[PDB]
Amino acid sequence: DRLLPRVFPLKLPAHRRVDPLLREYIFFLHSMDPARFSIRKLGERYGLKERTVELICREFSVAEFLRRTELATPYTRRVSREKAVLRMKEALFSLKLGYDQLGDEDLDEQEEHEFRGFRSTQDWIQRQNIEVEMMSAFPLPAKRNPLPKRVDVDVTVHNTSKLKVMNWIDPNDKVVF
Amino acid sequence: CSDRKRKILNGTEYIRRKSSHRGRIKRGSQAPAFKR
Amino acid sequence: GKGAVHYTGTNFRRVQRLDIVDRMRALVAQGLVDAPLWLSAAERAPPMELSNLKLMDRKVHN
Amino acid sequence: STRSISGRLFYKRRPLQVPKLKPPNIRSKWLEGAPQKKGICVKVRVQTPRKPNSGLRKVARVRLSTGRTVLVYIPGIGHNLNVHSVVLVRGGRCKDVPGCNYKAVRGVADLLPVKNRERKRSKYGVKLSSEKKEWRLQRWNNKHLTIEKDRELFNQFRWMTWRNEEGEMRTSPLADDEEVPRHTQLFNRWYRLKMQREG
């Protein structure tokens, strides 16, 4: 049956699933009082994620800027093929089921055992999919823990309208001063 | 031995190689004989 | 090259002996055969492991 | 499988015991690792291919710039090579002719390109003729064809509001002696665009 051409549900962004009027309401609240109507608070009230709220606000601000400046209509902004297909997907989703009147996401996702691709099925550090172990009723030697990789990073320290200065950090250098 | 025995079989060595075994047509050895 | 010169290797075949209960359980689980009526009785009275008992025969000097 | 690295002198013995097959492209050893060499035709003739094949193969013995003399096949139909003719020679094996391992590059030196050739032109040094270039443009002057479904649909939907090339409007469906008109903004668009861009 692995060769059966099954049809699976299509995935759509939450910021495109929620109703446009809810998007406008969120944009109004954020553009009015970003302190009282924080991104976290808006997501908490409307069952969305902070990233989703940010995307909603950005998209609505762009659309409103274009409309009020009379630069382009909602059907004349040049976009990519992927975004055109996404617009079609949401149009058919609304025509079939209708826009959601409230968010259904979770603010802080949970530690749930789910398959999330082949990368999720193995211990990359150990380079093993199977933990072979002996049977005993007494403690066994502990496993050697990995040590976090010490990789270089750049941290900006002074930025102006002309010059950007950032410190190149080597976490292995013992003498720090 | 493959190409070497092929040369032996086709007879190039029989002509061009000295033999302490002598014979009336093969080249002879005028020095004391030893395994090489 | 050669053929059956691999002693302690591919000369022998190390394959499991699957009896009626094992084969029928596999067939039913994979859905290639409808569950026979005798299968429950066979499972509740599994066949013995005859190869292990066979390995117990020992040659004796006369 | 590790019986060949026994002892102390493995690092010198085993590297000697390896395959000794001929090089992949030893058939063209007289080019001296070069893409091609110039040579002088010392002899020009026709040879008989090995059986079962029959016919005559056009061949020449050519003295390369390196001084070696080799057998070279003359690919194509017809040639003008004679003795004391300079030819560029590349690696190519003509299986029919015994011992022939090199070919002659057409259109270089005194070896003229094959005549009356229109396919595989780059393999015989034939340029794209002006007639061919002109036809590769005049070929895509699209032709107008109808299947009477166009007539049905035009008389059912289009004739009601239709505009002629000059802008004239229609007042009656298509007659029996009138072809379906072309679409003024879609028919022959590519060829018309190219012509107008040219001038």
Partner: protein, 240 residues
């Protein structure tokens, strides 16, 4: 890589080529998407609308759209979840070892605890659909106030399984015996490459030239159609 493919060129769909095959010659034919699985998640209209008013009466949902855009929370979903919840709680329900092992089994079945969102099924302050009613939790200790037990929330994993089962749901005689028949059917490569997309070849062609090919087709296919149809019509006229 660069240049044309040197070697064997096979259709990416997996269909054979021949005189009476879907393809006449060798090729990749990556533009021919009719030979691969493209679900219809949208609507469909007709060439003509018989009605005198443009009411959009020809527009209709595609069959695959009902699986593309599903709706969850339906009554059969609820019923299936109820039955499966009963069966799935059977173990903790019939455990008779002790509170410790009962809690262990309950946590294994539905992980929960501080900082976690569980169903609260095992909590003493949550209502369950017991067969034989008993004290919520002898007379000395109880809750002197009303304090009704709170409802139990669903098990998210099981509910998701129940909801997703829909995507995997699948929808005398003229006695002429076949002698030129196959005993065990056959499994060609096309049956796999039609729907298992990851097995197909990724194109090295420029998207510019892919789009150009589409644009050329949109203008040339009708001409070939009319060429053959005109041949047939001219032959019929000559016969007439």
């Amino acid at each position: 890589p660069r240049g044309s493919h040197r070697g064997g060129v096979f259709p990416v769909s997996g269909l054979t080529w021949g005189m009476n095959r879907p393809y006449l010659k060798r090729g990749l034919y990556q533009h021919r998407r009719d030979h691969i699985f493209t679900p219809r998640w949208g609507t469909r209209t007709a060439n003509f609308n018989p009605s005198a008013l443009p009411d959009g009466s020809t527009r209709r949902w595609e069959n695959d759209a009902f699986k593309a855009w599903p709706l969850y929370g339906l009554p059969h979903h609820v019923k299936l979840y109820a039955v499966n919840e009963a069966r799935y709680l059977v173990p903790a329900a019939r455990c008779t070892a002790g509170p410790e092992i009962t809690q262990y089994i309950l946590n294994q079945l539905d992980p929960g605890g501080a900082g976690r969102n569980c169903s609260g099924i095992g909590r003493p302050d949550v209502r369950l659909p017991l067969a034989k009613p008993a004290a919520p939790s002898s007379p000395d200790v109880f809750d002197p106030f009303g304090t009704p037990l709170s409802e139990r929330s669903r098990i998210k994993r099981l509910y998701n399984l129940v909801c997703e089962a829909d995507s995997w749901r699948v929808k005398n005689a003229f006695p002429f015996v076949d002698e030129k028949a196959a005993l065990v059917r056959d499994l060609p490569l096309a049956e796999i490459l039609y729907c298992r997309h990851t097995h197909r070849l990724q194109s090295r062609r420029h998207p510019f030239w892919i789009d150009m090919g589409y644009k050329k087709r949109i203008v040339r296919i009708p001409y070939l159609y009319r060429r053959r149809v005109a041949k047939e019509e001219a032959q019929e006229r000559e016969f007439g």
